[PDB]
Amino acid sequence: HVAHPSLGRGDGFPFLWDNAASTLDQLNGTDTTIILNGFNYLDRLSMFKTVLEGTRKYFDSFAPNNTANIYWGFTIYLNWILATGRSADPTGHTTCGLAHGDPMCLAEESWWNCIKYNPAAIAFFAAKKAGIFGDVTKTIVLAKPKEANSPYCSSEEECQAAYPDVMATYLDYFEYLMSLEKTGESIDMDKAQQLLWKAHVTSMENSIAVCKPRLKNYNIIERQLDRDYLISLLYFAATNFPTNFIESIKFVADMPHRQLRFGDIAPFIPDMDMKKNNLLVVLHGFYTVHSLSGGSSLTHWRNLMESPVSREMARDMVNLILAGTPVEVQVELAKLGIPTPVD
């Protein structure tokens, strides 16, 4: 049994989905503690699954099996980083995440692990604080990293102190959900999605500098994919594109199913379909507009995306992209009136 990059266990749900905890009471611990290893795939999956379960009631009517829940995004991406080897140690110094080592271990040295840790762990703490899990008197005890002055926080208090804006933005999301029963209002899906994206973006922006050195652990082609993806995510987030089950699977199905290497040039990678080859070009297209504009294009894009009509039009573009339609990022952005750069 191994994780499939886009199908997870087989039907889109993550590898080992059934094995992960639905509630805090199913986790290991003591009378006064709950134990979680943030460097273990199953415990990270439990950080997502417990929040999915605890927020199911807000999304239940919209679709079966909690599939309308917008928390699926980073849950599905956890499966993908495992399945494609991107959570393993890339340095060769340890066997963490390798088949001949502990395949569930998530390496400190992994760039993907580095950027994705907080959207699991800090978000989990924020959900706890907001009351998503009910009243919890037990202390969360996280496994500590080995590296001194690590980018990985290992307690509720340390995470708050090191990444205050990330804690605050995820808290805003969960507090909004918690407010709905007092009012008796049904969820405003566009608002909920905006709040969650704001937290994800804040996390990415708070991690980019501290995770940057890990990019040097990968060859230049894989390294550039990593950069391309993080910048592109900032543009996608501003469109308010949905992060529910079906849309998340649609995205990961277009991502490369293996690490890239020297020799790979999109859109001519012969062991990948046209949709994967096309998304690789598009991600680099966003990187290029961003780099050549000194980052100014993102500021203009965000201003434009203050309009709900603009956001809907931009989501239409994203859907074309996900279907494998070969659109030129630079050309499409200009159409939307973004001042675009020359070299």
Ligand SMILES: *[C@@H]1O[C@H](CO)[C@@H](O)[C@H](O)[C@H]1NC(C)=O
């Ligand atoms: C939920 O998903 C499971 C697994 O894919 C499926 O067998 C089942 O039909 C779905 N449940 C409902 C109520 O639609």
